[PDB]
């Protein structure tokens, strides 16, 4: 048994801007109310409970390459 | 058995800008109330529960790939 | 058994913009309310209970190119 | 059982920005009230509860590479 | 049997900016409020409750490269 | 000439109410816009422009006598 | 020339009320945009422009008793 | 020329209350904007420009009683 | 000429309450902007521009009386 | 000529209250910005241009009583 893996990546992932602004973020405040009584989180858990926020992201770039090599033998 | 496995990926994802702006996001607030009593989350869970979320996201960019190579003997 | 895998991509995901923006995003706030007693989750769970969330996304280019490849002997 | 892994990878994540700037983020306060009784986070749990959170975030490129290798023999 | 682990990975992930600034982040406070009674914890818990956090970040590349890999006999 | 003003005035207005209560007045906010461009209010004038008002009124009475007596010679 | 002026007055305007309660006021938010040029206000001028208020009025009573009594010669 | 202005006022402006209460007032913020350039107030002006404002208001009372009483000659 | 000015007042402006209270006013913040130039207020000129106000009354009593008397020879 | 001013008042304004209190009073903050160039204020001016003001008012009375008497020869 002969398994060979050799995948090639010579790609582009590519941004170019000019100008990049006069950008405004004005949130009115707000109400959140949030009741529970038990929380029980067990395994590989990811939570938000009773939020109000505010995020302004203006990267430049921001671009992204994500990737996954798996080999099961 | 003879197994090969070698893609060839020599792709682009691009992208060009003169002038990116004059962006306002200006939420008017808002109520947001969440009742619940139990909350039980066993494996791999993602949540969110009563949110009063604002996001302004203005990349240059912004770009992906995503790619995904998997195997399995 | 002699299995040859060797896709070849060599594709372009690409843009061009002169100029992007004056753009207004004015939410009037509002109500939301949500109810409930028990939540149970419990393998690759991906939930949002109770929002009022206001998104802007302006991304000079926001081209994607996804790609899955599977073998399996 | 021979297996050879040999992926090659000269990939390209790259921008290029001239001007970035006049971001203005002024959020308007707010109230958040969360009421809960039992937290119980038993394994790889990640959490927030009850927040009012303002993230500013301008990076200059802010470009990801994300990769997992996985062999299992 | 022979297992041979040799990725090459020649890849670049960078950034240019010419000017970044003129950034202006102004919350108005705000009310957090949070009542709990047991916080159990086990294991690999991360957790933040009840807060009001202001957050600036303004780097001028910001990008970034992960990589795993992981080889199991 | 001879002028007699005597009128005599022994009403009642009451009333009597033995529970008030559970009112809710829940506004899901709303957009108000108004443009004008000359405003010249000369002489006992009353006015309200551009609004988005919430009036929430329980009095446990609330009962009005008005009265006017004018006499002219 | 006799003018006698002598109303007589023993009204009774009232109220009342066991129990006055549970009352919510829960207003979501909103906008509200006003644009003029040029405002000219001369004599007894009353006004209000471009509000977005909120008023909760519970009296015990609330009773009212207007009068107005004019006589000229 | 004989005047007798000698009017009676015996009257009663009444209220009596149990007991008052669970008055709950919570507006979720909001958004004003007015914008205006000249404004000329001449003579007895009362105004309110541009505002958000929240009024509770619980009085055991508040009952009125107003009256005038204007002779000329 | 004989005027006679003898108005007589035995009147009453009353309340009683057995209890006053739980009483709860939490405003969600909110945004208020208000441009102008130039503002000339010249005579008996009251003004309010550009707030953001919370306002809690809960009297005891709160009851008003009144009254204006005008004679004019 | 002759005037006589006697007005007679043996009036009452008054209340009784039992018990007050359990008032809560918790603004979430907010943002208000105004701007202006020239401000003339010429004669019995009364005035409030830019604030965020938070008033709590609990008087256990807080009754009133205002008289005018004005005589003019």
């Not at 992932?13 to 949130?27: A, D, M, Y």
Request: aromatic share 4%.
């Amino acid at each position: 048994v002969q398994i060979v893996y050799k995948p090639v990546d010579l790609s582009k992932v590519t941004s170019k801007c000019g100008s990049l602004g006069n950008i405004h973020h004005k949130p009115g405040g707000g109400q959140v109310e949030v009741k529970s009584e038990k929380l029980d989180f067990k395994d590989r858990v990811q939570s938000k409970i009773g939020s109000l926020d505010n995020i302004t992201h203006v990267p430049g770039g921001g671009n992204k390459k994500i990737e996954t090599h798996k080999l099961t033998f």
